Amino acid sequence: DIQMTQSPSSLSASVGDRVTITCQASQDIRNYLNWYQQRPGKAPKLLIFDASNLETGVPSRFSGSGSGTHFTFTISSLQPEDIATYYCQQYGELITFGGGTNVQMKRTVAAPSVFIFPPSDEQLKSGTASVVCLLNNFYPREAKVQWKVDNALQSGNSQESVTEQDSKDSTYSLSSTLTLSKADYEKHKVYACEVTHQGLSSPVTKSFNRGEC
Amino acid sequence: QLQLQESGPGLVKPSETLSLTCSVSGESISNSAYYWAWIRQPPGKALEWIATVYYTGRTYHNPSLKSRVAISMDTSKNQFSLKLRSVTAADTAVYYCARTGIVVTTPDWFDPWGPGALVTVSAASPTSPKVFPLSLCSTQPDGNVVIACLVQGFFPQEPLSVTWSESGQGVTARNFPPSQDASGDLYTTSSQLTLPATQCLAGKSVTCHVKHYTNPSQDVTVPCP
């Protein structure tokens, strides 16, 4: 019935930035508009009730304003701990949530530490072979992990996994797993993951030859 | 303290009915002061309130789900329940129970919440992960040892938790979100343990504990370099 239009859907800001999320109600809800902060894998926690009021256990940098249809949620000085998804919620008519705003932190460029893991004996005995390439504590999030088997580009046989931005040092971690049959694994020699990232002047290649680890 | 705990199945086959129970402790749900609601959240999507129940039997419902939803309340058990019918993949979500009616005589905001229970709408049955010890073939980094556990082909993707026998000072565990396999339908992730070489001597080994779904935790021996 009443729709909350939350803008933007996501944002990136720097430490101390003034961050403002806007929630427009499709009709008047007076001040019956609340704001939630949700950490990944956790339930949302109430920060602002009744458009402007601070709930217990909420830092003073969080605030809200507005009454009627247009509402603003403000982080006056964005901290790395404040990275989360934020939702407005109205109760003027039943309960509806805004689309959400995930807030990401901007920091200085940090190159990833790269680690390659060959397939285990136990996995090879099981018929599959997985090469794992790990990237540790990098910023920005954008990172390329390119797989080469005997200098041949691998397609459709890898999977990536990026952690949530760290609430302390604002970095990311990445896992890329190239998966083959044991038959295709034993048909080749050189296995390499090439990592491309802004923090690296040139791409880093971690490689190994099959059976020599 | 007031605590809420969702209970329910991990999986419900498509078109069947999802049943969830919230166990409330530290407050009486028959009290006129508070209402009791269910909220859900599909992975990567926004929160969605479902329904609210009150001791008088009054019920509120999300208009887009009222037809498929039944919310009720057991004052003797001090529990309230949710029933969602006709579940499809669109109903795969984390389901939260929460208290509302905090300041006004009608639902206002939700506090506190339950931990949330994932419900996966799938015809598939649970697949346990095959956990494999991983040994670094790269150069070991700066006085530490890097070992890993491969957690391959499990379903559902959550709840998957990996812990290690070693922890504390000098130890950092890194976990990654489960990734859908290119193979098909199953999920794979990894866990990385960085710890001082002092703590992972040759011949010794560290144990990584992979607890998935409701099954007991798998314990796999990961040899030190």
Residue numbers in the entry:
A (entry chain B): 1 to 213
B (entry chain A): 1 to 225
Authors' text:
Interestingly, antibody MAD2-6 bound to a peptide P17 that covers region I (KLKQP), which is a conserved functional site in the N-terminus of PfCSP associated with cleavage prior to hepatocyte invasion. The epitope targeted by MAD2-6 contains part of the epitope targeted by 5D5 as well as up to four residues from the region I KLKQP sequence.
Similar pairs of peptide backbone hydrogen bonds are made to the backbone of HGly96, HVal98, and HThr100 in CDR H3, as well as to the side chain of HThr100 in Fab A. Unique hydrogen bonds are also formed between LArg30 of Fab A and the Pro5 mainchain. The difference in the number of hydrogen bonds to the overlapping epitope (from K4-K11) between IgG and IgA Fabs is likely due to the higher resolution of the IgG Fab structure. Additionally, since the two copies of either MAD2-6 IgA or IgG Fabs come into close contact while simultaneously binding the peptide, they display homotypic Fab-Fab interactions, which were first observed in anti-NANP antibodies. Although both MAD2-6 IgA and IgG Fabs exhibit identical epitope conformations, peptide interactions and homotypic contacts, some differences are observed in their constant domains. Furthermore, the IgA Fab possesses two unique disulfide bonds in the constant domains. Thus, differences in the elbow region and constant domains may translate to greater rigidity in IgA Fabs, and potentially contribute to stronger binding of MAD2-6 IgA to sporozoites, along with other factors, including higher flexibility in the IgA1 hinge region and Fc differences.
